[PDB]
């Protein structure tokens, strides 16, 4: 399951949506667009924990972020936006304070986003998929989805 959040220039979440049924179960019930960045990330993880989808027994989470580079002004400020974006999720992570849980962050450009749109899949998942192709391992979206993120990382 993957969860996609939309934020504004003010680093404020405006729209929250789940791409998967499991994702909707955890994403649903979250009312706080103003502070969904850190709060939703930590609450969602707990929701998954309660549902049983995620187990504290060694769990890796991959988070991908993308900014609009179409604007020159945005590109320059992009470095500042990226640093703040990482910091906001960092706080959520600090909230969890779970040693067994390790986070990972990556950057996504418009090129990857366009590809994600074509495949109607989350850009974050696309990133992992890209690595799989490089490895040459026969990996598919459904198979990876059925497998845990931690399991995918460790091969």
């Amino acid at each position: 399951p993957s969860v996609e959040f939309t934020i504004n220039s003010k680093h404020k979440v405006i729209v929250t949506s789940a791409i998967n049924q499991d994702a909707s179960e955890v994403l649903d019930g979250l009312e706080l667009k103003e502070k969904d960045l850190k709060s939703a990330l930590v609450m969602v993880l707990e929701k998954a924990e309660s549902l049983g989808y995620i187990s504290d027994d060694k769990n890796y989470v991959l988070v991908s972020m993308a900014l609009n580079d179409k604007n020159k002004k945005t590109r320059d400020k992009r470095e500042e936006k990226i640093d703040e974006l990482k910091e906001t999720i960092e706080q959520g992570i600090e909230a969890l304070d779970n040693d067994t849980i390790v986070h990972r962050t990556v950057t996504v450009d418009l090129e990857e986003r366009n590809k994600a749109l074509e495949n109607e899949l989350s850009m974050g998942r696309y990133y992992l998929y890209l690595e799989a192709k490089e490895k040459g391992m026969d990996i598919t979206i459904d198979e990876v989805k059925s497998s845990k993120i931690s399991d995918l990382i460790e091969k």
């Binding site: 399951p1 993957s2 969860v3 996609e4 959040f5 939309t6 934020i7 504004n8 220039s9 405006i14 729209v15 990330l41 969602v44 993880l45 998954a48 989808y53 995620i54 989470v61 991959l62 988070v63 991908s64 972020m65 993308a66 900014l67 609009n68 945005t74 936006k81 974006l85 996504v108 989350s122 850009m123 974050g124 998942r125 992992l128 989805k145 497998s147 845990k148 993120i149």
Partner: peptide
């Protein structure tokens, strides 16, 4: 254009 930026999270 309305959405300035967006982020995605992959978790199983």
């Amino acid at each position: 254009g309305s959405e300035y930026a967006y982020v995605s999270v992959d978790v199983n």
